[model samples]
Target chain A: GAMNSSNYAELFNNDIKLFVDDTNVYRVTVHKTFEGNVATKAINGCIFTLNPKTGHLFLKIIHTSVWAGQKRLSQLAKWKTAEEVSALVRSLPKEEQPKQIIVTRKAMLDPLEVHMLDFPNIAIRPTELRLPFSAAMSIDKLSDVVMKATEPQMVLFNIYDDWLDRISSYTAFSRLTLLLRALKTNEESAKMILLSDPTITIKSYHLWPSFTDEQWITIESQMRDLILTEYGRKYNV
Target chain B: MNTVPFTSAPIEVTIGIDQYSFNVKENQPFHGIKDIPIGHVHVIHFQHADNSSMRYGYWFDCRMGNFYIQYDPKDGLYKMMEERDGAKFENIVHNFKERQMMVSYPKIDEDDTWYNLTEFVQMDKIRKIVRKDENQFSYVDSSMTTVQENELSDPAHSLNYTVINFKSREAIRPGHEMEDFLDKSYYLNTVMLQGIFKNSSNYFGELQFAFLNAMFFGNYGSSLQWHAMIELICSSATVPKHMLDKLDEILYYQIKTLPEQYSDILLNERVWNICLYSSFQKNSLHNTEKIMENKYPELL
Candidate 1:
């Protein structure tokens, strides 16, 4: 519960931006507030939608490595002839193409359990304050603690705030802006399906803090060299 | 092959052969930063006769002292493979006593496990760890040493140094080989927890009855996103409808030009996602969306 200087300027913020006016009125206000459908999310600001009948259809996945059973995410990638899957769903591109796709596949004996996973309908689900009166930590639970983190991306090398306090998690901070959020996003619940193994246990998101992609690119170049070494630590002479 | 010419420094082994084909990527839904984004090292790239490859990672096996790395020690290919493995681990610990006559003398719990070897038999300082990339390594059981006449070492040798650093390696997917084919880490973790969770999953498993380390264990298998994960997990769920027609009958056998995703689309989509999705191919091409909105209604 210590360390200050505005907590090392909010413990290396990693600026996120948006709301620049004009420019086709910001893609017609990020496609009328769906926020971002693309054109690189209105040049990277807002409008980041996942959109499966109102988002998070369990992170609308297609990622493959193995599947024991269950298909139809446009038939998992290829193989055809029974009417070439309506000519491969008419060669996609008509944005958000998947109208109907179910990908269940089981095998859980160790599904990370990332908080038992029941998105109910578009959710982030973080709960652990021991769930007393329920509905705890809001603002989409403090903006999924910086949208489940690490994307100040791009770097040559600069890290070392004691190796981002030894790869983050200063013991779940935030008693009131002490910062260091997400100490645990839960995980371990592929329930016990064991269908025959397609190398399950590949979540990546649903608030991934279980880092690796070489320590999430060293916490994405250690909070962008503490803000591009201070946006170019400006001086002017 | 008859005994040495030296005891320490002269190590210069370098035979080369890397072609390793089978990196068939062609599916894209997402997971960016040029893929290999979330999952740490577990890759399997395929490309038909696409060099029908094989070579995997995570092993340090100092002739059996134990090692599995590449998460820390960042880049320069992890500091050029740990400074080329600490310059040949001081000449393989002074040629570790002629491989204790029959492959012994391995203590390296790591000072970077003496140069993570694939070579170094320099007349019997012997090393190993190359074939099927020795998945997750470890050695020195010395018949579970509980010495007395000279108390040669005990504490059941740290119970196999935490059961060989709590191993978790998988790869045996090509035709599933379910009962321990090779690097059988607990029979590929109980045939990958009985074939990919068989079920909400994550972290990773449980199974015990060590009865003196389960007087038992088969099984082998194995990665990657080289062509959007083998044209997307070998299309059509639970894969096998004659497994893409036995990889186009291996293009009448010369093994060339095969790539519109077969040549066993990346060696049998992780055993059709684990053992021909089991009921052994109870007629597997199950595609739905009500067969594309009932008989391809103008391609949706």
Candidate 2:
């Protein structure tokens, strides 16, 4: 269900004085886990830049090791911290301060930290509860939320909640497949920039029980099919 | 260093070439055996024909499939040949992409003198010659045989072994273009699905699927420890039966029908595992083993 945009009018709670660009881009960080200590928390995240003119969404995956600091696990750089986010928001020339800045509820920054983002000069509006789940939820569930959002508004669904396995329901799985079909029909609205996290490299292990490389491959093939069918052809993610 | 005279042709070639030819005849027995570890066997050799009469060495692991052979004659070489090419001739030594050789004769400029060997014996032809010979053969190490037996009895063990072996072979084996051995081995190894579900049915299945998505979709970020990743995810929480079924359907049927994508998918096993583990670690805070049992049985 799409929440009324007006109810959270003060999402960012900022003054309009520092405005520059009026383009609306939503930075949504889909935190991976909700329970770990600060360092290990927020495993995976995403940044979606929505262009108001074309209604197209561009994606950037936020890997934990990249933005999160090693020290008390408290330091957050760029999209991870509200202060840095405000800096980014204010840095934009005039109209580009993004009409609404929606962050995930369980984002690394708590409510108080995010409140600091309410600097008067930037007028950056931030929302934490735009999506239904906290962590990375199912992509299908994500699409449902996207479908409900009103156009001309920059929306971010902090999805990919690993805590919730929608596969537990046949209906959920069916809905996901159907959603893919729908998205395929209307690809332009959610144009994806599918660059994967190129920072990490996989290492070899001597023991890998339960599934063979072939079986792992079997499941991978299916996932690729689903992605291509729904998201259109892209490079490895 | 034994040498042979090719007076009949007044042959101008590298010195180790004769020694390698001799070594091949001597070590041919070990290469024919199927069970020998590839590391213990040698398949090719090169020798330098120079004033130093220096010797060099090289060996081939037929299981690793690739074709760029290189040589520098400032060094010398030795060669060994394997007698068997597997059940199929696909592993035959002679069927390589190109014949490359380097011969550094005394005062021979780096250019013009090197020539591709025109004549060579393919593995099948050699096999024909030794077909009637009653030569005794050495096999894989006794411990390796024991390990193989243990793994054979356990499906999970077998599955893990096959994957590791397949990947190792893919990385190092030469002339192993045929994937049938790995394919069949992997398929048979997966028969241990019931074992992966042993301790807790719900969690194991869900974790498996999650890891599946991780490996297939996520492009493993840092590590490739599949078994470790599976155990870590399983320690989190058990999934519902429905979720398990959905995961199984995708693994067993949906992906099986698409054969064309198998090759690319096989290469991604390591990366995908890493991605899956990272996802598991991130999402497992509230879902730890025993703890999740009390907190969210419904989620389990």
Candidate 3:
């Protein structure tokens, strides 16, 4: 079930901010994984969002602007003006201050779901969890957690403990991580078919999480690199 | 000091041309096959070539005629054809193994004279999507807000935003357009589902539906890779007679140029194997390889 706005308020430490210039909008520090954490997982991470009330759905993507680094602003010869920058930023609420960010290669819609709904609702995004399983890695840490604990009734239950501070930075990173999971799944499938026998029919791999040990080590190492590069040691801690 | 050109050597040469220069490479196999370590030789219709008794130069000077078949973002087919048409072409032969002749040439221009009729527009974008709705669980009917109030602002509206438009935004591919054409069916189905589930906070599901439909229809992103892979494979495949003969004519010319055992792997045999064979093979053994062992030893 979708959590209510009250849950968002509670989970985000009462830092939820809602506004509307063009679209009726609301903003909150979600204890949930930020879009960045799962960006790479969703093909449409650009526009997908989880609704907390009545389980209905609406999407508001920053259709007009994008998150800009300081390097970009200076590239405009420093004359674009702060007002111009704000004009662009005002269009997309997510990029305005994403608590997290996810980076991906190519694009797909599946990862977007992992970033917004699955990760936040399920605590560990299935797509991300699928990584260790798909890679056939030693799931001692992850399995230990899941084996003992039941699925959280609501990840929002522990909002403050998990979410805050980095706000958009945190969420964006989480979203990207989720997206990476999806991309990796598809990529691995492709690689498996190519690297396996070129003439043999491949089956039984669809949607299955089983991975060869080599695959596990490779993807695990990959995930580690992604986390390090995207989140840095400070964020990792 | 040694400029001997193989004096009085028996020589034979041939050259052919398609309409466009880039088209020359359209059928060029993917590169992965070359890594297979094999003896490969390719017969290319080059702009220039010569033998002891015969010589041929390009009908059009590439430097004068060369232009990147840039697509106009607006005009799809016309721009694409125009881009492809911009490549140079010519034909030649050696009637007597030791003799050759010339032909009238098409005048080509330098880069200064070359011009892309269509303005450039890039399709690539690193979309950073954000959603703004108060209730995380609420699936209110907000589609109207996007239309009626223009509420859905572009991400550029954020405090610091960048536009990802590329120069000469290349027009979408034909295969991409076809997928887009086929995607409408999927989109229509999902739009109805969105209404049915309007109250469900399955926002993520809804988002997936929206994008899958859009991408499948022709948003021209992920669909491109899928189309490229499928089309390349389908071109040579058939059911009844299994007449892949013409395809071999194609395969031989391309694969013969590879440098490894799998030199022609990309378009050689690997593609078909991965897409068709292994998928089914594993499926056949899935039951026997049951990782989840039987709870009881007795067979039912």
Candidate 4:
């Protein structure tokens, strides 16, 4: 189905497509590449003709791994890239699957930060930087103003590194671990904010072991302050 | 300078639910008790986000468990999965999909065995029975205590500057909304705090103040503020003139000028401890001193 005329119309220019089936999402993209021979039996190994509007992609090869790769690619792009690439991603047959699951998995876990489990000891690891980066990138990508032109991406990237370095030195090689501990503590605060709000169904999970409201708030409040104040004004997202 | 500190725009709305209103100070059960009186009580609730135009009616209770979780019956999602009690329940969204009214009266569903619960008694109605069985029955009015317009408009009590300074030594954003979802989280959290601190400890002021600071500044490394402040005080080094002056100004003006109700309490526990703890090791104390001298301002 075509995107709501309002949502993805502008994105069409960027070649990205988003199709929502119930809550599940499907994305497609098409792009030209000069890297490989166009006649290599498959178009980028995915010779399928795709119709992003109809959720239809005709592929030549068939394999479970290839199909999985297609799905992973679509999920990773998540309406962030162009439509041709999206279609190509969605239509990749399972047989030609790459072993780059980590990259795809990282994309899947981008919002949830569930990837943090990979490195248990590092508190403030490289991954922590991803979220702020992604947020900054999003703001820069979508932000439009006519007169005062500024490079938000460059500024954000610079600040991101500055923070990464600051956190890295907070406790020597133990920064990642410390950062994780802080995140865990901050998660408690987030949970508290969720549970305590006069407006959530937090009690339904009454059976779950959770940090008390105060404990959670403590973590959240601290995190908010640190991010806003300690990092300086330039990266004040 | 809007000076209007709040979550961004309040784009999405949600009502409160899943609350535990416990009266720990009384120790005696108040209202909702079935077989046990020690557990938390469910108080006022609200409906989902979009339906917040008519916000107040979302609360739910039965004179036994006065808790409210008010959301549109059609668009709400309720989920719970916990291993501690071997409990799991997911509804709301499922029901909405089916377009059915919520009639979960703790009926014996197939999933009951997995939960280790003997029967499917409605959780909101079980406290009285449990309290009776345990001989700790305390009467609590399970009726909803609606949050009125006047009450909602009341300003949040201010934190003592000394305490705020101590608790927020790292000096992150003093107060700002990080995100809409996160700000909603703040509201949800307050509901939980009310439940946790409902007439409970003598440390109510401390608890409330601590949580307020934690929520506002904890994320930004400001949670280190208190320790840093005390460190500055203990260090015998010739104090940085600016830091000393700022400290003096805050303590003399803010700390000394606090309302009678709070001045002593703020000074006694949160403030002085960070400044001078003689019993603790000198190394620890000395380190704190050196660390506290450099103070960072919280982002506004």
> Judged by DockQ relative to the true structure, which candidate is superior, 3 or 4?
3
Candidate 3 global CA lDDT score: 0.23
Best-fitting candidate, scored by TM-score: 3
Per-model TM-score (chain A alone): 0.18, 0.31, 0.18, 0.19
Model 3, B12-105: lDDT tens digits are 2222221112111222221110111111111112221232121111111122221112223353110101112322221111221123222212
For candidate 2, give the docking quality class from DockQ: incorrect
> What does candidate 4's lDDT look like per residue over B1-300, in tens digits?
000011111224332222212221111211111211222222122232444333221112233322212223354422111112211112323333244322222223353221221111233233321132321122112121212212322112121212212112121122321221112222212322233323212112222222223222221122233333334333323333443443433333223223344322333343344343442222333323333332211110
Question: Who is ahead in TM-score, 2 or 4?
Answer: 2
> Candidate 1, residue A57: CA error in Å?
22
lDDT of 1 at B240: 33
Q: Per-candidate RMSD vs. true structure? A: 28.9, 27.5, 26.9, 31.7
The CAPRI quality class of candidate 1 comes to incorrect
Put down candidate 1 lDDT per residue, B57-153, tens digits, no spaces.
Answer: 2222233321212212232111002223643644443354334411212233443211111111121111121122233332221133212211224
Off by over 4 Å in 2: A1-45, A49-64, A67-84, A106-237, B1-300
Report model 4's TM-score to 2 decimal places: 0.16
TM-score of chain B of each: 0.17, 0.16, 0.18, 0.21
Better of 2 and 3 by lDDT: 2
* Winner by lDDT between candidate 4 and candidate 2: 2
